[PDB]
Amino acid sequence: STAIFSDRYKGQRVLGKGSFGEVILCKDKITGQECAVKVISKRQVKQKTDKESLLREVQLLKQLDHPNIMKLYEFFEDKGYFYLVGEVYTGGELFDEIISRKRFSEVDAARIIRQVLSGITYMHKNKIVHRDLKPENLLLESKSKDANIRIIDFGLSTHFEASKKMKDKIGTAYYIAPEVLHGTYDEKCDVWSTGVILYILLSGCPPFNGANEYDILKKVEKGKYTFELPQWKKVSESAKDLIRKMLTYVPSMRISARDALDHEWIQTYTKEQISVDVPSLDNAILNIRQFQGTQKLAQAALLYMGSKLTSQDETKELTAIFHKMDKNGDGQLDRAELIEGYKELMRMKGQDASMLDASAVEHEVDQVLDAVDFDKNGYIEYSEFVTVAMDRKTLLSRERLERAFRMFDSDNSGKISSTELATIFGVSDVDSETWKSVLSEVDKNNDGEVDFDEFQQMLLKLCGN
Ligand SMILES: CCOc1ccc2cc(-c3nn(C(C)(C)C)c(N)c3C(N)=O)cnc2c1
C-alpha cells in the first residue's frame, strides 16, 4: 500500500526555484493545509548516499523543532522525483527584505545573526551540518516587520550532489568555507558562512570577492580579508572581533556556533532596551542593494538562457510527438490527444514540476486553448497550439529578466554601462572575450551601454541563437 504524493497534494502555484529543485505551493486534498514542496529531479541531481541513509535523515528532520529552522512534514519518492514537503513561508529572502528598509544598524544585524546562530547551534547538537549556508537560505516567516528567520535546506547537502551548472551555483563561492573545498569539513563550516554573512550585513561587500567564480574561490582558499574599507569605521571593535573568530582559518580554532551566541557583541547589541550608540549603516545598505541587484540580474540572465534552450528542446519534441499522432497528415488534432501528447512530452522531458499529475496537464491544455481563438473542443491545428504552449513557459523567465533588469537600473537610465555588464557576466561566469564579441555584433556602433532590447539580444546570442 505505497503512498503517492499526488494522491494527497495538488499543486497550486510555483513559489520559486531553490537549490536542488523547484518549490511548488501545494495543498492537501482533504485537510486544505498549505505546504511548500521541494521537487528534486533524479535525472538532474545525483544522490551521494544510499536509500537507507537518506530516509534515516528524513525521519530525524521531521522530529526536530526550532523557531529558526524550516519545519519538514513529509517525504515522497517516486521513479523520477523526491518530494520534500515543508511549512510554507511568505516573507521572502532576508536580503530582499533588508534592501527595502531605509534604515539598518548593528542592532538589526545582531538580531538576525542571533537567530541564525540559534538555529545552527540547535542543528549541530543533533549532528546536522548545513554546508551550503548563504543569504538565499534565510527566509522570513511572514511579510511582518518583526518576522522570524527560518533556515531552509538543512540536510540536503549531505545527500545530494550540488549542481555544477552555473545557473544553480550563482552566489555560492562567497560563502563556502575553505575546508569544504579541500574536502575535510565538520560543523564549523557553518560558522564560517555565518561569519561571511555578518561581514556583508555590516559592510555590504563580500569579504572574499573577484571577477568570477574561480577568482573568488582563490581568495577564500587563501583566507585573507581586511576591515580596511571606509564603512568599517562605523562598526564596533566587538563585532569585528566576532567576525575574526568566525572567519578563522583552521576550524579547530574557530569559534563554535554556541560560543558565538555568548559573544559580547551578540550580548550587547541584542538587548532590547539599550541602544547605547546605534547609527544607521546607510553605506552598508547601499552596497547591499547593489550587490543584491547584480546577483539577481545574473541569476535571471542565466535562467533566461536556460529557458530559451529548454524551449527549443521542447518545441521540436512536442511538434514531433504530434506530427506522429496525426495519422491524417493534415496538421489537425483534438483536446484529448493534445493532452496525451503533452503528457508524453512530460514522460520524456520530466522538466515541469507544476505538472505533478494528469489533472495538471488537462488544465494547462485548457489554458492554452482558451488563449488561442479556438473552440476548446472541435479540432485544432497542432502547429499553433505548440507556439502558444511554449511561450507560456518562457513568460515567467522573460518577464523576470525584464524585472530584474528594471530593478538593477536603479536610476531609471534605461541602460547598463559596459562596466556594469562586466560585473554581471563575471558573476554568471561568461568569458569576457565571449560577451564583448557578442555585444560588438548586436550594436556595432555602440558606446559601452545597452538597453533592455540589446541586453536581451546578447543573451539570445550567448545561447546559440
Ligand atoms: C529537507 C529539505 O526540505 C525542504 C522542503 C521544502 C522546502 C521549501 C523551501 C522554500 N523555498 N522557497 C522559495 C523562496 C525558494 C520559493 C519557499 N518559499 C520555501 C518555503 N518553505 O516556503 C526551501 N527548502 C525546502 C526544503
Residue 321 Cα to ligand 1 middle (Å) = 34
Q: Which residues pair with 160 in a beta bridge?
A: 47
How much is the CA Rg of the chain, to the nearest whole Å? 24
What's the CA gap between 247 and 245, in Å, rounded? 6
89 lines ligand 1 (CB under 6 A): yes
Residues near 239 by beta carbon (within 8 Å), at least 6 away in sequence: 106, 109, 110, 198, 202, 265, 269
What's the CA gap between 122 and 261, in Å, rounded? 11
Residues near 148 by beta carbon (within 8 Å), at least 6 away in sequence: 67, 68, 115, 140, 141
* Count of Cβ atoms closer than 10 Å to residue 317 Cβ: 16
What's the CA gap between 342 and 351, in Å, rounded? 12
The best mutation among 15, 47, 143 to test binding of ligand 1, ranked by most ligand atoms within 8 Å of the C-beta, falls on 15
For the packed helices 335-349 and 282-325, what is the interaxial angle rounded to 10 degrees?
A: 120
Question: Three-state SS for 16?
Answer: strand
Each as own residue / partner, the long-range contacts of residues 368-372 (CB below 8 Å, 24 or more positions apart, any chain) are: 368/392, 369/335, 369/338
What's the CA gap between 64 and 121, in Å, rounded? 13
Residues near 231 by beta carbon (within 8 Å), at least 6 away in sequence: 202, 203, 204, 281, 283, 284, 287
Binding positions for ATP are 38
For 38, the enclosing helix (H) or strand (E) is strand 34-41
What's the CA gap between 389 and 267, in Å, rounded? 56
Binding positions are 38, 326, 328, 330, 332, 337, 373, 375, 377, 379, 381, 384, 409, 411, 413, 415, 420, 443, 445, 447, 449, 454
Residue 86 Cα to ligand 1 middle (Å) = 7
DSSP string, 248-315: -SSGGGSPPHHHHHTSHHHHHHT-SS--TT----HHHHHHHHHHHHHHHHHHHHHHHHHHHHHHHHHH
Q: Name the nearest CA neighbour of 105 among 230, 268, 262, 282.
A: 282
* Count of Cβ atoms closer than 10 Å to residue 60 Cβ: 14
Question: Three-state SS for 34?
Answer: strand
Domain 1-90+154-161 sits in CATH at 3.30.200.20
What's the CA gap between 419 and 421, in Å, rounded? 5
Q: Are strands 72-77 and 34-41 parallel, antiparallel or unpaired?
A: unpaired
190 lines ligand 1 (CB under 6 A): no
Contact 21, 133 (CB under 8 A): no
The architecture in CATH of the region 91-153+162-290 reads Orthogonal Bundle (1.10)
For the packed helices 106-125 and 237-246, what is the interaxial angle rounded to 10 degrees?
A: 30
Contact 98, 128 (CB under 8 A): no
132 an active-site residue? yes
Tell me the residue length of the chain: 465
Contact 373, 259 (CB under 8 A): no
What's the CA gap between 198 and 240, in Å, rounded? 10
Q: What are phi and psi of 190, to 5 degrees?
A: -70, -25
Q: Name the nearest CA neighbour of 286 among 247, 246, 236, 229.
A: 229
Q: Is the dihedral of CA 400, 448, 409, 208 positive or negative?
A: positive
C-alpha cell at 403: 524585472
Question: Three-state SS for 404?
Answer: helix
Contact 374, 365 (CB under 8 A): no
**Unique residue bearing C-alpha cell 573545498:** 181
What's the CA gap between 391 and 314, in Å, rounded? 11
What's the CA gap between 39 and 24, in Å, rounded? 8
Enumerate helices (H) and strands (E) in the chain, giving the number of each: 19, 11
21 lines ligand 1 (CB under 6 A): no
For 77, the enclosing helix (H) or strand (E) is strand 72-77
Contact 70, 150 (CB under 8 A): yes
15 lines ligand 1 (CB under 6 A): yes
C-alpha cell at 307: 529557458
Spans of all domains in the chain:
1-90+154-161, 91-153+162-290, 291-465
Q: What are phi and psi of 146, to 5 degrees?
A: -90, 20
The best mutation among 12, 17, 23 to test binding of ligand 1, ranked by most ligand atoms within 8 Å of the C-beta, falls on 23
**Unique residue bearing C-alpha cell 537549490:** 19
**Residue type for position 154:** F
Contact 195, 243 (CB under 8 A): yes
What's the CA gap between 282 and 284, in Å, rounded? 5
What's the CA gap between 205 and 201, in Å, rounded? 8
